[PDB]
Amino acid sequence: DEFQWKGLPVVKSGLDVGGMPTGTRYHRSPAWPEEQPGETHAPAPFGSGDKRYTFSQTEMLVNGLKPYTEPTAGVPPQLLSRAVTHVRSYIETIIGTHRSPVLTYHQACELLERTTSCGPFVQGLKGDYWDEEQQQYTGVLANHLEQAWDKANKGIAPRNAYKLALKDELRPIEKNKAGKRRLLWGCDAATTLIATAAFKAVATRLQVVTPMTPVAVGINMDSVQMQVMNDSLKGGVLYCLDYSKWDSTQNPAVTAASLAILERFAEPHPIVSCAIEALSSPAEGYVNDIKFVTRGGLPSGMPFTSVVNSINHMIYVAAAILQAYESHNVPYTGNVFQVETIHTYGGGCMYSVCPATASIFHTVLANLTSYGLKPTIKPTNTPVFLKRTFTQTPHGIRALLDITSITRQFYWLKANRTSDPSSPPAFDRQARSAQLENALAYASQHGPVMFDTVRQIAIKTAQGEGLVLVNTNYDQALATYNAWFIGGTV
């Protein structure tokens, strides 16, 4: 029986999943005891210590879960069909109509992320149960997986259940003041296994062919693939959107259609239906002794979140463009993704529209926001995608990582948990230096001048952390990035 919990419609789970982690893994770097000019990010609030601050973590959870309680308008039932077949047809013409065989049990198991949680039903990390050169899972997780597997082949779908938490990361100071913190949903490992077996081969086929499909997932932004994307933009009117609150505004019907398109490139199988059944159902987030069941939107932690959401984006935008043409009563000749050029990774997203669609992009936007989306409207000559500014360099176009993304890595370091971010960190030294070697290699792509200011920051950091760096000068830092980039080898 439903009941209110902090303003949220909630139900007793029958378990006690526990409270959310207190504290942060982020420490301020020993070499940087005060706030440098331009500094704009800090560790997200972390509870009773999180000490500069003071919000109730549970209220920060509830605040984030709130958008999932009020559902979205979606796409008109009869536009959806037309948009769907545009999306399905275009991806049919580039990856073909072969239906990919379901993965075997061992293949899906080894594809699971071992560093992360087992979900709400099993405790610890997945890699507490991994046995190598038996090449399998062992003990009580393996029991959880084998059962879900056997049941899936019988047609019993796994639960769309998640362990709710909060993402420990560096967020804007403004957002930290307001008690904002991003949601983490740790999917039931079993559900990931089933969904991996069902769609991994389809996602791989999309990845092999990126960015020839508006599903960009898997793209090496530090390779030639990024230039392929950049090349595709020429000749069109460029819009660059990064939609706000994308996860919580995803329509269940659009998601069902997206899962139906993936279904088309997979062998019909008890496992595929079970995946579709699970990933189609409302997401159940477990926290403490309750569970919250979504009324709309999509959990960020869902298996193949990037792929499903990117097909969602395709459906949404195709619908919006068609609708626009329909209202202005102009026939839409060909496929949306040939006439226009689209690239999506979840909630963003670049559009290279044709002069005819660009003419009526106002209506296109109004349609997207009428579906319940929030795009976040002026054309641009600057392609921004996956947090990268596409910029001309003396050695070709490069996807440039925010200068602030680079420097921010030197002032803070990910280490042990703490309620005091200022306390001296205990960290793997050689790994820290690897991160900062990489950081500098990125920096180098910004030119000799702006590299040097990062160079100086890197050397001070070397002193205070007792490190040794090789990319600490321009040419060596250039050489190593280029090695990547004609390399493919990041």
Curated annotation (Swiss-Prot):
Occurrences of domain RdRp catalytic (ranges): 236-361
Domain of life of the organism encoding this protein: Viruses
Catalysed reactions listed for this entry: RNA(n) + a ribonucleoside 5'-triphosphate = RNA(n+1) + diphosphate; Endopeptidase with a preference for cleavage when the P1 position is occupied by Glu-|-Xaa and the P1' position is occupied by Gly-|-Yaa
Disulfide bond positions: none
Parts forming coiled coils: none
Domain topic, free-text comment: Protease-polymerase is composed of two domains displaying two different catalytic activity. These activities may act independently.
Function, in words: Protease-polymerase p76 processes the polyprotein: Pro-Pol is first released by autocleavage, then all other proteins are cleaved. Cleaves host translation initiation factor eIF4G1, eIF4G2 and PABP1 thereby inducing a shutdown of host protein synthesis. This shutdown may not prevent viral mRNA from being translated since viral Vpg replaces the cap. It is also an RNA-directed RNA polymerase which replicates genomic and antigenomic viral RNA by recognizing specific signals. Also transcribes a subgenomic mRNA by initiating RNA synthesis internally on antigenomic RNA.
Name listed for the protein in its UniProt record: Protease-polymerase p70
Provenance organism: Sapporo virus (strain Human/United Kingdom/Manchester/1993) (Hu/SV/Man/1993/UK)
Full protein stretch here: 1207 to 1703 of 2280
